[PDB]
Design a protein around this ligand. Sequence first.
Ligand SMILES: CCCCCCCCCCCCC/C=C/[C@H](O)[C@H](N)CO
Ligand SMILES: CCCCCCCCCCCCC/C=C/[C@H](O)[C@H](N)CO
Lengths: 48, 246, 246, 96, 293, 293, 50
Amino acid sequence: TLWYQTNYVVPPETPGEAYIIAMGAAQDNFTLKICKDTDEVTQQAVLQ
Amino acid sequence: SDRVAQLTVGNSSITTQEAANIVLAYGEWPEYCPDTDATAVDKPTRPDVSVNRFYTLDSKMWQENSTGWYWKFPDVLNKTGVFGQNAQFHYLYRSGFCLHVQCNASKFHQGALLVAVIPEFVLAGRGSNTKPNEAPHPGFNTTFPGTAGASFNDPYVLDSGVPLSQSLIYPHQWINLRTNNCATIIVPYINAVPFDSAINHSNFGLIVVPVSPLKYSSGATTAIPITVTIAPLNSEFGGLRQAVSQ
Amino acid sequence: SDRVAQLTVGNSSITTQEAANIVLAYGEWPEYCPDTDATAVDKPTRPDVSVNRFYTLDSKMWQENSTGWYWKFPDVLNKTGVFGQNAQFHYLYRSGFCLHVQCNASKFHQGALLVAVIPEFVLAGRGSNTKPNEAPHPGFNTTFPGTAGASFNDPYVLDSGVPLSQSLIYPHQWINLRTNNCATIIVPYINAVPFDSAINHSNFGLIVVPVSPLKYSSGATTAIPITVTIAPLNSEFGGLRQAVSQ
Amino acid sequence: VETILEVNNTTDATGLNRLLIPVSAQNKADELCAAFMVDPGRIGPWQSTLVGQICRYYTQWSGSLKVTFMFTGSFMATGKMLIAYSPPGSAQPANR
Amino acid sequence: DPVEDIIHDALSSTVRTSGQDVNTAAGTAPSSHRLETGRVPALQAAETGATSNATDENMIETRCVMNRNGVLEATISHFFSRSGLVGVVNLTDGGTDTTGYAVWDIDIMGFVQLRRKCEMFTYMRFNAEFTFVTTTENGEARPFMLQYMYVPPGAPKPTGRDAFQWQTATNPSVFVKLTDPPAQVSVPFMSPASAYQWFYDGYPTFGQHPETSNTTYGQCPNNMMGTFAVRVVSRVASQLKLQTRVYMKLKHVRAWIPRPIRSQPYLLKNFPNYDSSKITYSARDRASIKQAN
Amino acid sequence: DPVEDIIHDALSSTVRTSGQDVNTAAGTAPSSHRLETGRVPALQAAETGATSNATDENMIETRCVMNRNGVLEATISHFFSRSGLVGVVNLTDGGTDTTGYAVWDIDIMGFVQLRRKCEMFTYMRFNAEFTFVTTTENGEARPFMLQYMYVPPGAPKPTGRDAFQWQTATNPSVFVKLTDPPAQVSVPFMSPASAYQWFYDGYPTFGQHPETSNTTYGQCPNNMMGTFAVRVVSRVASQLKLQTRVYMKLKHVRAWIPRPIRSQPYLLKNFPNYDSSKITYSARDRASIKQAN
Amino acid sequence: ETGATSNATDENMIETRCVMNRNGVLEATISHFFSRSGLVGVVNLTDGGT
Ligand SMILES: CCCCCCCCCCCCC/C=C/[C@H](O)[C@H](N)CO
Ligand SMILES: CCCCCCCCCCCCC/C=C/[C@H](O)[C@H](N)CO
């Protein structure tokens, strides 16, 4: 969870909204286990 | 190369990029109680991770006619955190704090802030009456405000009859909105006794005074807050007993 | 020369004069988590004095038609003691307990008591129905009774479908009112995972069963209580977070 | 290697703006900007990062995870933010 | 040096039963009568929880026996080496049942004879050797072909007979005929935990837990390890009533924390619920106390 | 060795400003002009809380001065070496006042001129040298004799002129005449604490504390150190109006944690209460900003 | 923004501990990631009267 610590303080003649890009990854000690069919494919028709 | 700063205590990890220069109160790091001076014959406890975290107090908004705020230590932490549940269960206590206060503002704003710790920061009844049995006195919630932190009534004398102009004898660091948005202090255990109670004797205070008033040309952020993040180091606890709220 | 016994952990110091022989579960002392097996990458905390005390549970009275009692660990300590306020603030946990149970009686009384720890002491719905959606199940307060400790309903099968006659495979020690008024067990951390939750997974149980019924000729003390004093050793805590009652 | 999360995976956020969390000034302090469940295999934002897609090909995962947060605001606008990871237990906290 | 109290315990925080390898039975040496006070092995104190060590030499006029009886077959490694039934599936592929597939979640608790063995040990760790015997309801074998896909937790489960999950580009599958000797597969220790747990004195989740019906009790997922599906390899249905038993062996077994043997009959799968109305007493009922049959 | 995490910090739990002895004033060496970039001692950052070290040599064309001004008189040891008034008693021994004795609890906060000095340092530790000047209200000395008993906390206080407490078999007492040079006594550091405290951010007791009138606030007892009584040595009353000032010196003083000097006037003894209606501004009021008198 | 991955290791953020890990990375390599066989095609050899 990300919280406003103090504020988004803006000078005059500047837009008073912005954006943050949240980028994620894995640290060096990332290790994985047995294989698994993913969930993001549900092919219905055979590709013709 | 000096403006960045990385302080990490416990599972926390604070960073400030614009503020610079840690000031250490009186040139002595916080250390444990030495063997040759302690009196509590029982073994004291050293959690060192659960309690030594950067607990963040509440945000106090800065207005153009603001007066000041203040807190008391370790009074601000007795209801929250494992340190709260550790101080309610122990008669004796010793720790050294790593104060850290933040006030973010734009490069078009102006203002300054006096941040200083005040050892044994007593307060003073605000009244001309000198009748001993009818003497004005500060209330409990006024002198022990808790996690929130009360405000001043006349900051020029610190609500104690001591002028603010001389208030830099104490360890301090200025927040000034042109060069630094943050400040920090590492203070040791300052007490004439090796240990003390935690819910009776506050070791020191903290003041955040708007010396120079926040002034901005209209058309910008009007609500400037102030947050203080606090972190005890080398804490101690002894004399276990039942709970005690106050 | 062997009947006396002095166990002192933390600021406590227990003594028993008539009971003899400490039994250590499975011949391994309680030890900290080794470096080569832990998974919690953050530093864990080692108070070692505040938590490692002899907390005393409530007295349970023994009647001539009594059935039994039982507790769960570390469930009995989550509302009380600094250990309670430490488990509510930490997701992970590891400790090893020093059980100790007391049942005082005169040299004219008779009776015996089976004291045993039960690893992973699940319970069982008491009903002949096998409908999966209408299956009888034990309630929460029945399986996690807390500091009080609930009673049995049929002790001969331990309320789990396991006969009490075989229940001595587990570490145990008999209280028998002719030779010892007390018993004690030192149990290590028994769990298939290096750490676990403290308010979800109970590591083990404890049973105190009146195998031989208390029988006394009329004209003596009729109210015999049973007290259990418990004491964690080499406790651990990690993953600090907010409070969680249950 | 980093890949962007679709942390703004809400209705009324369609198009490219799913990848961006808004940030505006708050007149009232102690405000919650955003939050998301860290579980990669679970549905949610991590379906858009690679490490959450590739984790689905396997059953179990271990090891520390890290997230960065690039700010796209103007040069003169400044602000402090608090990024808090909460271990499991209760739900996401109410106030900071 | 700054303070002794912190260096004392840390130095003394070091590690705090060297049993031998017993190849045969235990022999015995002779022993004569000994008429002396102070030394008694009979009058032990079982109340301390210890086993009495009243050895045979120390009670009677024994002899010299150099035993030779082998203890090889009593170890746990060869005690669980026997394979045993685990589950049955009912792949009722016919005209009425328009599914063509049958999914079965792995639960060895479903059948008693293998269950009661592993209940003796609370934490176990082993590798498995599954065996899928194959037949029809009549016991007849036929010229057909089957598919046996393991569907781990989180995988998409099959939906029908022509499902895309049977493409099995990642899921391990066994393609085997029905005129075949039984398929046999070794399986490793695929727990997310370090060791299996047949018991869990608590809940998987946090939060409230009701007291009227506690269906989430005693269900640790570290042993709960996904499903296992079967179909006949065909896009149109062949009318046959199939029922394949599945058997497993336990090898490289390592047990921990022995548990007593359950005497009461089983009533459910994941919960050890007995019945208060019919307590099955372990011992058979005798006539009187002094009438050994 | 069993686990590195416990031996690492314990080994690194060791102890974590070697100022010189300055006998004279600080001299100065010459300095020439230096016209170079990168090196500037003026443009400091007082915002870090540090003092700017813009020495005189580094700003102007200074000279060589080997100073000789002594700093001996500025140390704290000789700053508190002056004795000063502490209290007065009013032993009004006459016909109306049928007491013959006067008790006064030691409180140096009663008089401002000595108070404002010790307020500069929060924690002090010293030995005292009390001096009891003796006279009548007219300034006249007379041929009489006085007794000066120290009554520690817990002792029985005197009740009258013929009280048994004046037997003083344990309490230290000073028997002195009024035609005498002033009595003078050294007093040690008799705190129960390790150092005196002029301030206490809390309460002596636990429990509730009201918010309407907090009379127990800011009263540490470690400095509160009992009473001090006087009578004339006589069992019948002699009619004279006596008033003896008491003076003390501070020696072997060791201060700690310097505190600013109080500017507002004092109103009470044990509480630093000022008045909001009359804030005494420290600086005198000028005409305008650019009109230095 | 430089395109690099941040190397904010766990030791450098929090009060970590000592863990000598043992989790095997053998199964995550590409060699054993594609070692699984899988469906490719079907043919329809409809050998009949028509
Ligand atoms: C394509 C191969 C099919 C065979 C593979 C199926 C997965 C086998 C995994 C075995 C997991 C351990 C044994 C399971 C025991 C119980 O089901 C659970 N411990 C709890 O009920
Ligand atoms: C018979 C000898 C009479 C003189 C002895 C009287 C006791 C003197 C003890 C001095 C204690 C320290 C000085 C006292 C200062 C203030 O009174 C307290 N710190 C608080 O008000």
